[PDB]
Amino acid sequence: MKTQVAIIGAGPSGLLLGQLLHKAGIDNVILERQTPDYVLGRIRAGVLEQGMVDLLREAGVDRRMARDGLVHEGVEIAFAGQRRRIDLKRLSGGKTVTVYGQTEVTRDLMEAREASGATTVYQAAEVRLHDLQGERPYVTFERDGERLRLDCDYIAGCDGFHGISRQSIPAERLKVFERVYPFGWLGLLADTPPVSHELIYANHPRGFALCSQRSATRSRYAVQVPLTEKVEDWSDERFWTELKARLPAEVAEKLVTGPSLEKSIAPLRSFVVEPMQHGRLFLAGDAAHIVPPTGAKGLNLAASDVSTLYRLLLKAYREGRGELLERYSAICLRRIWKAERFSWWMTSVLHRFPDTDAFSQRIQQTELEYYLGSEAGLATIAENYVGLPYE
Amino acid sequence: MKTQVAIIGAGPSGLLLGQLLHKAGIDNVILERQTPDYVLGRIRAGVLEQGMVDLLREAGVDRRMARDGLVHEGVEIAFAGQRRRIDLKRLSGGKTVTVYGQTEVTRDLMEAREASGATTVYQAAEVRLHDLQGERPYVTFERDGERLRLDCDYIAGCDGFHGISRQSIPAERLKVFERVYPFGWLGLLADTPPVSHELIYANHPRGFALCSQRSATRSRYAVQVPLTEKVEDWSDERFWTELKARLPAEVAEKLVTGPSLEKSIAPLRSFVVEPMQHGRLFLAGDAAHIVPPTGAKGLNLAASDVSTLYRLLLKAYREGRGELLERYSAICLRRIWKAERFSWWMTSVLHRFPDTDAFSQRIQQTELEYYLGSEAGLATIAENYVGLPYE
Ligand SMILES: Cc1cc2nc3c(=O)[nH]c(=O)nc-3n(C[C@H](O)[C@H](O)[C@H](O)COP(=O)(O)OP(=O)(O)OC[C@H]3O[C@@H](n4cnc5c(N)ncnc54)[C@H](O)[C@@H]3O)c2cc1C
Ligand SMILES: Cc1cc2nc3c(=O)[nH]c(=O)nc-3n(C[C@H](O)[C@H](O)[C@H](O)COP(=O)(O)OP(=O)(O)OC[C@H]3O[C@@H](n4cnc5c(N)ncnc54)[C@H](O)[C@@H]3O)c2cc1C
Ligand SMILES: Nc1ccc(C(=O)O)c(O)c1
Ligand SMILES: Nc1ccc(C(=O)O)c(O)c1
């Protein structure tokens, strides 16, 4: 089989790129190792920048989002007794963010694709990339027991952190930057009303706590836990008690608890690979970089990467300007580093780190006091939070 | 001998407090271990916040300053090839800073005092504080070979980092926060024209470099060096070569070099003691806290401490409200922590740290890129730099 752009991975990166390209006339084929259910089993993100909200409307897949996604104009940071709200809409110059589950976005895009009739091969085993530097690179995979071959012009590595794309680029060509945090987040999804109309990021001596929502009858919560904790050790009861212990008393007593729908511990990490391409292979989303979830930048960076890749391929196919595709990494890395710096900051001022002396405790505390107190400080949180502009 | 407020140390803290109090009718006595020449031999600071510029005018010692001090409306940060200017006057809402040597300030205040006829005992040896919690505390010292006794109501510990005041408060009463940096600054004063009309803070792979001035025919420079470097190893020649190597080529070739008047290596440190008082003893300036010089906050925090101590003693003596003097530490520590956080930040984004991995290099670089590029970011540097308001 032949195609123009072969897409590895059917996560939101791949589905979004595949959807945008299809709509532009560029035929693409998606290869996914798992089944649609497995992909839809992932809870992950819930906060979307205005830029992605527009990319979806552009991909033509926004009906449901316009209806169910929630527009927010502020967040709340809670520390040392106090709860401080950040008015995003006025501090950013009118921008806001939309809360809409990642699982929903995937579900929508997945519906959109199936109806379009565009090719999607789920259960594609042992995918291998070949001739990345030639004019005709190709992909081999197994469907059942038959090794098939797919010829294409370009390959988009949207297969996430442990995908095959990044491992296909010769090591000596990529320079890796990485930071592993000594903690993870134990997340939880539950069919209960959220405790707040806006999100609450809480710094507490016992660790970080997050109060989020997916809808008016569905909440998403998380608490920082050591990397040594196994999820089967945290009963629902244990979670809510721990959650209540880390929140402001006035919030903890408004909390409507309930049985969990999903629970899992995600480890924290920062990871950037430079550059993000090799010959005719271009990396996007988690295949190239990882940011700790504290800043909600993961899904959002995948969308911006994809937005840039889509727009550079339109020009190459449509305007014959394949030279522009060399600019890909440079354009993406500028955003990527800014977002990695903001995600890192958010993480360091809201989380409790082990083995921290008195001076750093006081500085973390003061970082919060200064930033939530200054008008200039709040603005840096706001403009970064709603997401910096696309270049 | 008796007095109302005994002042230990004749540095700018002591002289300023002593001058303000004298003018208010409150009699004070200053005790200095060294000689006036030794004190005037110290080069130290050169940048003053508007708040101190006003405190001096209030202490009535500003004629010379109004004439020789230089008002600046911007600074320049130079990194990775580029040189970015920060317009302080518009980003802070009209504030600026004054460049005027610390040695000058001391010299002025010292002239003012001698003419006032107020008591100053230079060469006061082996000073000891007694009865700090009684109603009549006292100070003993030796002048030549005679141990004299000074009775007073209150004692102001303005004796700097290694003074006797802080060691007089029972250890179990103070909680100490401290950070020692793995480097120091090798400073240099020279009778040459400065290379810039505004200061230049430079981040370079070889380390930090600073271009400052004391006047139109006098410059002050500094370069970050390891803690293992002895000043006698750095000839003047060696300094300028090193300085030129760390600056932008366009600046390095405008540099007018020359023989040094002064040279010395000052180690970097962050230090805060809580609280800043014990009974009838109140700590001020370096006696209580140390900030790395990167943010120019040292002399400025001494002035604000002194401003608060002076104003709380006016109320006690003048209005009989000695209860207010309990509020001293709390008022001072708020400013102190904000300034310690800003000085720490400045230090971490302009200095080269040993044993730093790739990720942190990129973050330091991006911290600079984001802050010098955002309008909100530049404002946080500006408002902090010109100095936050006095409470
Ligand atoms: C474990 C994890 C937890 C996260 N949790 C959060 C969170 O709590 N909150 C938040 O804000 N962000 C979170 N994120 C980030 C966010 O979910 C991601 O940034 C976003 O899902 C990435 O989209 P993607 O398309 O780049 O990758 P993914 O969602 O990982 O999709 C990648 C696709 O690659 C497919 N695939 C993998 N290898 C192969 C292969 N060799 N061949 C074929 N197909 C392959 C995968 O099955 C998957 O469909 C999380 C990310 C991870 C990895
Ligand atoms: C080594 C050093 C270098 C510095 N360099 C810089 C710099 O390069 N740039 C910058 O911006 N800031 C610098 N500073 C900070 C700035 O110079 C200080 O913040 C400011 O001088 C402190 O004023 P002070 O009155 O609190 O202390 P000081 O200037 O230290 O004055 C304290 C006084 O205490 C007297 N004394 C000490 N012990 C006794 C005693 N037991 N009895 C009697 N008298 C005593 C001392 O002789 C001195 O006169 C430096 C500080 C230090 C300590
Ligand atoms: N930082 C954030 C904010 C919201 C969510 C969420 O799942 O709602 C998250 O996973 C991380
Ligand atoms: N950070 C700064 C700025 C100026 C001076 C100076 O001496 O001129 C300094 O010592 C430190």
Residue-range domains of chain B with CATH: 1-72+96-180+269-351 (3.50.50.60), 73-95+181-268+352-388 (3.30.9.10)
**Where does B41-87 have alpha helices with state H?**
50-58, 63-68
User: Is residue A100 annotated as a catalytic residue, yes or no?
Assistant: no
Does the beta carbon of B212 sit less than 6 angstroms from any atom of ligand 4?
yes
- Return all residues near B43 (Cβ < 8 A) that are at least 6 apart: B101, B102, B103, B187, B189, B220, B262, B264
Nearest C-alpha in B relative to A180: B359
Query: What residue has token string 């409307």?
Result: A57
Indicate the residue of A344, A363, A379 with minimum beta-carbon distance to B363: A344
- Strand A218-226 versus strand A209-215 pairing type: antiparallel
Handedness of CA A105, A379, B364, A370 (dihedral sign): negative
Beta-carbon contacts below 8 Å between A and B: 73
By a Cβ cutoff of 8 Å, what residues of chain A touch chain B? 175-179, 270, 272, 337-338, 340-342, 344, 357-360, 362-363, 366-367, 369-370, 374, 376-377, 379-380, 382-383
Handedness of CA A88, A89, A95, A97 (dihedral sign): positive
CA distances from B65 to A31, B48, B70, B112 (A): 74, 11, 8, 13
Nearest C-alpha in A relative to B341: A363
SS3 B153: coil
* Residue B259, preceding peptide bond in cis (omega within 30° of 0): no
Pairwise CA distance, residues A169 & A158, whole Å: 14
Query: Which ligand 1 atom sits closest to the C-alpha of A164?
Result: 41
Mutate to test the interface with B, among A88, A272, A366 (most CBs of B within 10 A): A366
Neighbours of B187 (CB within 10 A): 22
- Return the closest-CA partner of residue B345 out of B179, B130, B191: B179
B223 contacts B239 by C-beta, under 8 angstroms: yes
Pairwise CA distance, residues B285 & B263, whole Å: 24
DSSP secondary-structure letter at B348? H
Pairwise CA distance, residues A48 & A300, whole Å: 6
Query: What residue has token string 């690179």?
Result: A137
CA distances from B37 to A203, B122, B123, B128 (A): 52, 11, 11, 24
Residues of B in contact with A376 (CB under 8 A): 376-377, 379-380, 382-383
The preferred substitution site among B183, B271, B286 for testing ligand 2, maximizing ligand atoms within 8 Å of CB, is B286
Q: Side by side, which strands form the sheet with A82-87?
A: A82-87, A74-79, A200-202, A209-215, A218-226, A175-190, A260-274, A289-290
Cα(B299) to ligand 2 centroid in Å equals 9
Tokens at residue B215, please?
């006047």
Neighbours of B314 (CB within 10 A): 17
Q: Helices B12-23 and B298-318, interaxial angle, to 10°?
A: 30
Mutate to test the interface with B, among A92, A362, A372 (most CBs of B within 10 A): A362
Q: What is the amino acid identity at position B297?
A: K
Pairwise CA distance, residues B81 & A305, whole Å: 28
Q: Identify the bridge partners of residue B215 per DSSP, sorted by sequence position.
A: B218
Q: What is the 3-state secondary structure (H, E, C) of chain A?
A: CECCEEEECCCHHHHHHHHHHHHCCCCEEEECCCCHHHHHCCCCCCEECHHHHHHHHHCCCCHHHHHHCEEECEEEEEECCEEEEEEHHHHCCCCCEEECCHHHHHHHHHHHHHHHCCCEECCCEEEEEECCCCCCCEEEEEECCEEEEEECCEEEECCCCCCCHHHHCCHHHCEEEEEEEEEEEEEEEECCCCCCCCCEEECCCCCCEEEEEEECCEEEEEEEEECCCCHHHCCHHHHHHHHHHHCCHHHHCCCCCCCEEEEEEEEEEEEEEECCEECCEEECHHHCEECCHHHCCHHHHHHHHHHHHHHHHHHHHHHCCCCHHHCHHHHHHHHHHHHHHHHHHHHHHHCCCCCCCHHHHHHHHHHHHHHCCCHHHHHHHHHHHCCCCCC
A103 contacts A111 by C-beta, under 8 angstroms: no
Q: What is the amino acid identity at position A99?
A: V
Cross-chain residue pair B380–A374, CB shorter than 8 Å: yes
- Return all residues near A270 (Cβ < 8 A) that are at least 6 apart: A177, A178, A179, A180, A181, A290, A291, A292, A340, A343, A344, B359
How big is the CA angle at B337 (ends A204 and B41), to the nearest 5 degrees? Answer: 155
Indicate the residue of B338, B341, B363 with minimum beta-carbon distance to A341: B363
- Return the closest-CA partner of residue A100 out of A151, A145, A66, A57: A66
A113 contacts A18 by C-beta, under 8 angstroms: yes
